[model samples]
Structure formats: structure tokens, C-alpha cells
Target chain A: MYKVKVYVSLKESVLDPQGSAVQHALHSMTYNEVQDVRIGKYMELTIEKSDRDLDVLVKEMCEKLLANTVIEDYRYEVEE
Target chain B: MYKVKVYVSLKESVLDPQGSAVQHALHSMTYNEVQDVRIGKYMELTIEKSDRDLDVLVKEMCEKLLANTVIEDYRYEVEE
Candidate 1:
């Protein structure tokens, strides 16, 4: 079995309202030291042993569903 | 200046409806090789240079706003 850790984030051109809200809240708490905040999604998946190329499978999943390629990007780390 | 990459995930006991939905979708797509899926939040923060301890500041932020300790767990990595 392998563990896949995925990180999905909005493209730089996309606006992230949730991140902006967090940044505003931080400022209110006197954390004026912050310059910017961007929020994203993280996912963990357990893949059963398979003959298929793991990289290809991960990429396919990311493009098809894990990320909205038009406005988001995704990367993954795989470990035994 | 420093950059903080934060990962926030639900506790093991918590139900992850989003993850379940994704898992079902993957199965429907014939990716039955997947054993499980869990989804969470990821964030990037840019902080101005400061004299305060980085660990303390990050922990405080995670506890105060970045994560709900009662149901989620958070961890971060710092980069120059």
C-alpha cells in the first residue's frame, strides 16, 4: 500500500475569499505582521497495491477531480 | 520575512463527508484501487520579519483561528 498526500490550491490569478477572510481576522487580532494568506485543500489517500503507474494515476485523478485545472493546481507526495 | 505552510485535518474520529463523496466518485470512475480518502485545509501565510519566536506565533495562530482543536489538528512548516 502507498499513502498519497495531496495539496490543492487556487491558481495565483484566482481570488480566494476564505483566505481573505482569515487575513482580515488576523489583522483584527493584532497580527499585523501578516502580508498575505492563501487557503487551499489538503487530502490524504491510501492506494492499495497495484500494477498501474502511481504517478500516472495520481496525475489523472488530480486533473479529473482533485483539482479544477482551470483555476487550481495540485501536487502530491507518495510514501510507502 | 518568513513563509508558513499550514495543514489542517479533521480528527480521526470525525466524519469526512467530502472525502466520502470523492471516494465514491473515484470508485464510480473505476479507480477502485483506493482504500480511503480524507480531506482537509491547507494555507500559506506570508509574515513580515519579526523578533518573536516563530513557533510560538504559529501555534497561537493555529489555535486561535487556523484550526478548531476540538475536531481538527494543525501543523506547519516555515521557510525563509
Candidate 2:
């Protein structure tokens, strides 16, 4: 089996309200060193042994359902 | 400045409805190789240079606002 870790984030051009909210919460608690914050999605997928190329499968999974490519970007790491 | 990436995931004992939903979606699309799925949170924080200990600060942040320690666990990576 293989473990795939995926990170999905809003496009740089998009606004992240959840991030802003968290940043505000941090600043209110006096964490002034925080310059910026961006919130995103993290997912782990366990894959059973397969003949298909994992790289292509992972990419397709991200593009087709894991991420809305129009407003989000995704990257992943695979571990055996 | 330093860039910090935080990942927060539900505790192993906690039920993950979202993850299950996603797994179901993948299976519906013929991704039967997917054995398991776990959904979580990813965050990026840009920090300005500071004298305080980053490890302590990050731990505090995760405990106080970034994660609900009772149900979730968090880990982070720092980049220069």
C-alpha cells in the first residue's frame, strides 16, 4: 500500500476569508509576528497495490475532485 | 522571515465523516483502489523575525487557536 498526502490551497489571486479570520484571532491574542495566514485543505489517501501509475492517478484525483482547479491549487507527496 | 506550514488532522479515535464522504465519492467515480481517506486542515503562516522561541509559539498557537487538541492533532514545518 501507499500513502498519499495532498495539500490544497486557494489560488494566490483568491481571497481567503477563513485565513483572515484566523489571523485576526491570532493578532487579538498578541501574536503580532504573524505577517500573513492562509487556510487550506490537507488529505491523506491510502492506496492499495495497483498497476496504474500513482503519479498520474494522484494528479487526476486532485484535479477531478480533490481540488476545484479554477480557484484552488493542489500538490501531493506519496509514501510507500 | 519564516514560513510555517501546519497540518491538523482528526485524532485517530475520532470519526471522520468528511473523509468517509470523500472516499465514497472517489469510489463512485471508479477509484476503487482508494483504501482509506482522511481529511484535515492545512495552513500557511508567514512570520516576521522574532526573538521568541518558534517551537513554543507554534505549539501555543496550535493549542489555542489552530486546533482543538481534544479532537485533533497538529504538526508543523518551518522554512526560511
Candidate 3:
């Protein structure tokens, strides 16, 4: 079995309201040193197949379909 | 104090290989007929302030910064 963790974040120039909320939240909490917290989505999925080619498959899946090459960046890992 | 939950999903037209992988995994796990499960990112944040005006502020945060009104939709709640 293998598990996949994917994190999707907006590109540097994209406006991130969610991230700004968190930053403003920090400002409200008096955490002045913390700046520009980019918020993204994380997905944890368990791939039920016990096959050895799972890693390559996951990467291909992410590159081709899971993530957008232009606006979003994604990173994933498969473990035994 | 309150918490924010943000769910970020690709538009229907957007291709989701990650979602596809998850669906395929479900199929591999004997869960056929489950189709087109879109993958999204969820975020939870805890607010330290217990003020009553927070709901408006957080919503504004979401609208102005937390979410991309163009692609992603978001909702939030405030708790005492």
C-alpha cells in the first residue's frame, strides 16, 4: 500500500486571500515577525495497490492531471 | 476564539489527476461506481480573540485575501 500527500499552492504573483487572512490573524495576535504566510491545500490519500510502480504512477498522475503547471505547484511522496 | 475551514477544489473543467488517482484507488479497494471525486485542500485556523465582530472580519479576510473569488469559494464560522 502507498499513501500520497499533495500540497497545492498558488503562484507567487497570485493573490491569496486565505494566506492574507492567516497573516492578518497573526498581526492581530501580535505575531509581527511572521509575514506572508502562503496558504495551500494538502491532501492525504492512501493508494491501496501494493504494486512497485506506484511512485512513478503518482508523479505522472500529479504532473499530467493532479496539478496545473501554470498556476499551481505540487509535490508528492510515496512510501513503503 | 474561532476556526476557519477553507476547501479549495478545482473547477469542473479543470483536470484532476489526483482526484482520478483517489478514485482509482477506491476502485482498487473494491469501491466501484464512485466517480469523479474532486480533490480539494482544507485549512483550519484558530483565532485567539473571542470578540463578537470577528465573524465579519474573517469573512472579509476570506473575500479579500483568503480565497480567490475567481476560482475558489470559501465559507467560515466564528465560535465563542
Candidate 4:
């Protein structure tokens, strides 16, 4: 089995209203030191090994369903 | 200044419907190797330098706003 950790974040050109809202909320709550906030998705997947290439599978999944290519970038780390 | 990378994940006991849906979608797409999926929140925070301890500030923010301590766990990595 393999464990994959995926991170999907908005592209620099995309606006992240949720992240902005969170930063505003934090400032209101008195965390004035915060300069910026960028939020994204983190996912952990468990996969049983197969004959297919793991790197290819991960990239395919990221492109197909894990993230919207036009507005987000996805990256992954693998562990045994 | 410091950059903090925070990962907030549901406690193991908590169920993740979104993750379940994604895994199901992957299966429908014929990626039968997928066994399970757990999804969470990933955030990057830029904080201006301050006297407050980095660890303490990060922990306080997490407990107060970034995560729900009762059902989720948050961890962060600091970078220059």
C-alpha cells in the first residue's frame, strides 16, 4: 500500500474569497500580525499498489478530479 | 517575517463525506487501486515579525480560528 498526500491550491491569477474572508476574520479576532492568507485543499489517499506507474496515476487523478486545472495547481508526496 | 504552512485534518473518528464522494468518483473512472481518501484544509499564512513566539502564535490561531479542536487537528511548519 502507498500513502499519497495531495495539496491543491488556487492559481495566482485566481481570487480566493474564502481565504480573504478568513484573514479578515482573523484580524477582527486580534491576530493583527497576519499579512496574508492562502487556503487550499489537503487530501490523503490510500492506494494498494498495482502494475501501473504511481507517479502517472497521481498526476492523472490530480488533473482529472483533484483540482480544476484552470484555476488551481496540485502537487503530491508519496510514502510507503 | 515568517511563512506558516498549516494543515488541518479531521480527527480519525470524524467522517469525511467529500472524500468519500471523490473516492467513489475515482472508482467510477476505473482507478480501482484507490482504497480510501481523507480530505482536509491546507493554508499558508504570512505573518510579519513580532515578539510573540512563533509556535505560540500559530497554536493560538489554530485553536481560536483555524481549526475546530473538538473534531480536527492542526499542525504547522514555519519557513523564513
Candidate 5:
């Protein structure tokens, strides 16, 4: 039994409308210290068939269906 | 001048060593089809003295914070 976690974020150049919206609210609430925010996605994975080469499998998962390499990044961890 | 995003996770019960140790021998090699993966964390903020209502503020913040309310969760948004 292993669990894999993946995180994805937009490139720095890309405009983050969601992030910008949040920043405005925070500043209004008096949280002026914050500036320039970026947003991303988090995904959960459950690797069922535990094998000797689990790492290879999970990494492949991240590359294929788990993450889109075009404009995002992903990292994962596995446990058994 | 706007940006504020926060994401935290640990509820499903984190047995994660590095999330469980990159500890599994760094499991450096092998691309296996895996499952059972849980991970979370991402933030980006940008708010420039915007006049927005608090209602929209909170909602945006929640998404900003990303995901997680029990073990971990945050919200944010703003702009000008």
C-alpha cells in the first residue's frame, strides 16, 4: 500500500487571476505585507499493487496522467 | 500589488515520512504505475489596494489557501 502526492503550479510568467484576487482581499483586510501570489493544483494518488520497482511506477504516473509538463511542475512521495 | 495563497494538508492521516521518507531508499530508479498518493501545499498572493466586498474576499481566499480545512486549510484574494 503506497500513497503518492503531486503538486502543480503555473510558470512564473503566467498571469494568476485566482492568486491576484486573493491578494486583494488580504490586503484590504489589513494584510498589506503580502505581494505577488501564484496558484497551483494538488493531486492525490493511491498506488495499489506494491512491487519491487514502486518508485519507477509512481514517477511514471506523475509524468503521464498526474501532471502536465507544459506549464506546471509536480513532485510525489510513496509509502508502504 | 496583490498576491496571497496558502495551502496545507495532513488530514487523511499523514504517514508520509518526507510525506514517508524519500526514506524508501530514495527509490531513485523505476517508473511504475502507482496509486495511493496524498499531498498538498501551494501559495501565491497579489493584491493592490482594491475595493472588493468581504464575501468575495473569503471565497477567493479559500481557493487560494488551496485545500484543507480540518487538518490544514487557508483562503485569500484581492486586487486594485
Candidate 6:
């Protein structure tokens, strides 16, 4: 069994309005040092599978539903 | 100032229905090897403040708005 952590975030080409707004908001709060902000998703999946099947299973989940490949990119780390 | 990454996840005592459903979905999809899934949020922030101010700023944001401390726990990493 292995524990995998997946991180998904929007592609750089995509504009992040929320992040921009938050940055501006911090500026107004006198935190002008805040340059930018980007939000994303993180997931931890525990799988009882072999090393050979690990990559394929995790990737399949991400491609099928965990993340939207069109606008977001995802990467995962498997922790023993 | 620094690049900070924040990860927020529900407390262990909290229930994750969406995660449960997704695991079930994966099971039906023939991925019975999957044991569990826990979903969380991740965010990246760019700051232009001083080294001393970085910690205070990020922690304040997470506590004030980024995370719901009542049900979720959040931690951050400062990437220079």
C-alpha cells in the first residue's frame, strides 16, 4: 500500500481572478508586499496496490475526474 | 517576501463525504485497489515583504480567511 498526494492547479496561461483580487485586498490591508496568489487543490489517496499499478491508477483517477486537464495541471507524490 | 504554499485539509475527526463517494466511484470503475481518499485545498502566494514579516502575514491570512480553523487544519511552507 502507498499514500499518494496529488496537487492540481490552473495552468499559467489561465487568469486567476481570485488570486488577483486577494493580492489587491492584501495591498489595501497595508500588505503591499503581497505580490500574488494562486489557489489549487490537494488530495491524499491511500491505495492498496502494487508499485507497477500505482502510477497507472493514480493517473487514471486524475485524468478521469480528479483534475481537468484542459485548464489545470496535476502532479502526484507517492509516500511509503 | 517569499513564495508561500499553504495546504488545508479537514481534521481527522471530520467526515469527508465527497472523498468517500469518489472512492466508491473508483471502486466501480474497477479500481478496487484504492483504499481511501481525502481531498484538500492548496494555495500559493507571492509576497514582497521582509523575511521577518512573512511568517506573520501568511499565518494571519490563513487564520483570518484562508482556512476554517473550526474544521480544517492548515500548514504553510515558505519557499524563498
TM-score, structure 3 vs. true: 0.51
Q: Each model's RMSD to truth, in Å? A: 1.4, 1.2, 6.2, 1.1, 9.2, 1.9
Q: Order the candidates by TM-score, highest first — what do you get?
A: 4, 2, 1, 6, 5, 3
**DockQ values, each candidate:** 0.86, 0.87, 0.25, 0.90, 0.32, 0.79
Backbone clash tally for model 1? Answer: 0
Q: Rank the candidates by DockQ, best first.
A: 4, 2, 1, 6, 5, 3
Predicted structure 6: lDDT:
0.85
Estimate, for each residue in A23-58, the C-alpha lDDT of model 3 and write its tens digit: 888989999999678777788878887555776777
Best by DockQ: 4
Docking class of 2: high
lDDT of 6 at B47: 77
Q: After aligning candidate 5 to the native by TM-score, how far in Å is the CA of A1 from where it should be?
A: 4.1
- What's the TM for model 4? 0.95
lDDT per residue as tens, model 4, A1-80: 89999999999897788889999998998888999999999999999988889999999999888988988988999998
Q: Could you give candidate 6's per-residue lDDT for residues B1-80 as a string of tens digits?
A: 47899999999997889899999998898778789999888899987766456778878888877888999999999888
A1-80: candidate 2 lDDT, tens digit per residue: 99999999999999999999989989999999998999999998999867778887898899999999999999899999
Reference contacts preserved by each model? 0.93, 0.96, 0.36, 0.95, 0.68, 0.89
Across residues B1-80, which tens digit of lDDT does each residue of candidate 4 receive? 89999999999999989899999999999898999999999999999978888888899999999899999999899998
The C-alpha lDDT values of all candidates are 0.90, 0.93, 0.71, 0.92, 0.55, 0.85
List TM-scores for all candidates, in order. 0.93, 0.94, 0.51, 0.95, 0.52, 0.91
Task: Give me candidate 1's interface root-mean-square deviation.
Answer: 1.0
Residue A53 CA displacement from its true place in model 2, Å: 2.4
Superior candidate under lDDT, 1 versus 4 = 4
Candidate 5 lDDT tens digits, A1-80: 65555668776666778778866766686655556656676655666675547666655655665566777677665555
Q: Which regions of candidate 2 are displaced past 4 Å?
A: none
Give the Å error, residue A10, model 3.
Answer: 1.5
